[PDB]
C-alpha cells in the first residue's frame, strides 16, 4: 500500500552532479515530512537531510550543505536531492524515509535505496588469476565498477565455494576473492555486466 | 548528538532472549526508535515511541526505556530475527535525526579453529607487473581472527586488506580471506612469505609459509 520507490543513482566522477529521486504513492504525500538517509560501504545509518511536508523548511547534515539541496513536489508525490560537487567521501547508498503517522520522530517506510557511486576510476573489465582438504580458487582482480559474479563449473560446484566481497583497492579499482575447498576440472565463470567481460578460468 | 548502542555483537541461538540497548548522550525528549536492516535491504521500522511496536511487527520485540535509557528486547529468537540493529533519535527542532552504531545479532555455536592455505602469486599475474599473495582461513568460528604478514621475516603492515563472508547457512562459521599486495620487483627480492594466523580454535598461531 505505503511505498517508496527511488531513482537517480549512479558511478560519477567527483565534481560532477546527480539528481535523486522518491517517488510515493499509499499515503498523502503533502502531509509528511521526508528524509534522505545514506549508508557508505560496511557502515551504519547516517542522516542527511529533510524537508519539511510543505517543502518551505529544509536541514542538512553538516557534511553536505552547500552542495545538496532537498525538495519535493507535492503535486508530483516525489521527493529530490540534488547533489553538486560529489566527493569519494559521499559514496553510499542513500534511502528516502517518511516521518511516521503514528510518531513523527521515527521513520515509519524507506525507500528500496539508490547507489551513488563517486569515483575517478572509469570501467574496467577484471583480470581472473589462479589461486592453486586441499583449496583453489580465482583472483578476480582490478575491475570497476561494482559487481562481479562468480560461479563454478557452470553452476554445478557449489558445496565448499566461498565467494568473499570486493574490496576497493588503493588505486580506486575493486578486487575480490573465489575459492572452494575439495576433499575433475575447476572453472570459474567470472561475469562483469558493466563492460561486457567475461571470463572462464580452469584452475 | 550521541548514540551508542551495545554490545557490539551479540552471539545467541534460536529461542533465547535477545536483550540490546543505546544510551542518549542528554536526556531524550522524544522516544527513541529501533529499526531491523538485514545485508542489502533497507531499514525496517520496529519500534516507535520506545514501546509501541510498528505496523505488522510480531510480537516477540519489545522495547522499554525512558530519559536516557532503551532496551530493544526480542523474548525469543527465530532464525530472521539474525540482523543488524539501528536505535534513533529525532527531535523537532533542530530536525536532524541520529542513529546507533549498530549492534548484530549473530548465531552462536562451538568454537572451530580455521583451516589455513597461503596462495603465491600466479606466474599470470607476475608477467602483469603486479604481485598478491592470499591467505585463505577458511570454516572457523568465533569471528574474532589475525593474520599477520611477514616476508623474510619483516611484518608488513598497511600493504594488505582483507575480507570476510557471511556466517554460513549450513554451519554457521565464517571465511577470510588476506590479499598482500607487493610490486613484483619488490617480490622477486624476497624469499620466505608467510601468513600467521591467530585464533581461539587453535593453541598456538598457525603459519603457512612458501618460499619463492
Ligand atoms: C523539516 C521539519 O522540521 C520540523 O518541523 C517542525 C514543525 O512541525 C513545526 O513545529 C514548525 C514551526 O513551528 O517547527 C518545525 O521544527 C519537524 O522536525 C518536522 O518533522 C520536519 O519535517
Known amino acids: 500500500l505505503i511505498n517508496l520507490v527511488e531513482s537517480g543513482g549512479g558511478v560519477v566522477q567527483p565534481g560532477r552532479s546527480l539528481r535523486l529521486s522518491c517517488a510515493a504513492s499509499?499515503?498523502?504525500?503533502?502531509?509528511?515530512?521526508m528524509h534522505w538517509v545514506r549508508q557508505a560501504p560496511g557502515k551504519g545509518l547516517e542522516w542527511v537531510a529533510v524537508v519539511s511536508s510543505d517543502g518551505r523548511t529544509t536541514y542538512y547534515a553538516d557534511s553536505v550543505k552547500g552542495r545538496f539541496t532537498i525538495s519535493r513536489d507535492n503535486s508530483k508525490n516525489t521527493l529530490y536531492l540534488q547533489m553538486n560537487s560529489l566527493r569519494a567521501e559521499d559514496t553510499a547508498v542513500f534511502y528516502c524515509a517518511k516521518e511516521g503517522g503514528d510518531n513523527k520522530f521515527s521513520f515509519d517506510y524507506w525507500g528500496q535505496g539508490t547507489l551513488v557511486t563517486v569515483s575517478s576510476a572509469s570501467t574496467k573489465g577484471p583480470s581472473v588469476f589462479p589461486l592453486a582438504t586441499a583449496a583453489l580458487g580465482c583472483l578476480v582482480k582490478d575491475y570497476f565498477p561494482e559487481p562481479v559474479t562468480v560461479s563454478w563449473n557452470s553452476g554445478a560446484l557449489t558445496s565448499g565455494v566461498h565467494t568473499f566481497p570486493a574490496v576497493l583497492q588503493s588505486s580506486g579499482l575493486y578486487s575480490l576473492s573465489s575459492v572452494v575447498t575439495v576433499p575433475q576440472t575447476y572453472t570459474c565463470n567470472v561475469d562483469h555486466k558493466p563492460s561486457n567481460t567475461k571470463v572462464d578460468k580452469t584452475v | 548528538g550521541q548514540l551508542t548502542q551495545s554490545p557490539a555483537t551479540l552471539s545467541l541461538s534460536p529461542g533465547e532472549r535477545a536483550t540490546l540497548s543505546c544510551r542518549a548522550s542528554?536526556?531524550?525528549?522524544?522516544?527513541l526508535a529501533w529499526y531491523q536492516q538485514k545485508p542489502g535491504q533497507a531499514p525496517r521500522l520496529l519500534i516507535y515511541?520506545?514501546?509501541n511496536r510498528a505496523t505488522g511487527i510480531p510480537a516477540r520485540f519489545s522495547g522499554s526505556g525512558s530519559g536516557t535509557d532503551f532496551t530493544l528486547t526480542i523474548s525469543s529468537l527465530e532464525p530472521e530475527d539474525f540482523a543488524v540493529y539501528y536505535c534513533?533519535?529525532?527531535?523537532?527542532?533542530?530536525?536532524?535525526?541520529?542513529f546507533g552504531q549498530g549492534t548484530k545479532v549473530e548465531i552462536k555455536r562451538t568454537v572451530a579453529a580455521p583451516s589455513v592455505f597461503i596462495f603465491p602469486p600466479s606466474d599470470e599475474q607476475l608477467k602483469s607487473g603486479t604481485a598478491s599473495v592470499v591467505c585463505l582461513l577458511n570454516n572457523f568460528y568465533p569471528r574474532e581472527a589475525k593474520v599477520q604478514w611477514k616476508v623474510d621475516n619483516a611484518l608488513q603492515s598497511g600493504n594488505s586488506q582483507e575480507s570476510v563472508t557471511e556466517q554460513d547457512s549450513k554451519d554457521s562459521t565464517y571465511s577470510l580471506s588476506s590479499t598482500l599486495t607487493l610490486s613484483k620487483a619488490d617480490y622477486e627480492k624476497h624469499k620466505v612469505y608467510a601468513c600467521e594466523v591467530t585464533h581461539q580454535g587453535l593453541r598456538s598461531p598457525v603459519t603457512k609459509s612458501f618460499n619463492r
Open positions: 499509499g499515503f498523502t504525500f503533502s502531509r509528511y515530512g
Open positions: 542528554q536526556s531524550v525528549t522524544n522516544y
Open positions: 515511541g520506545a514501546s
Open positions: 534513533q533519535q529525532r527531535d523537532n527542532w533542530p530536525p536532524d535525526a541520529t
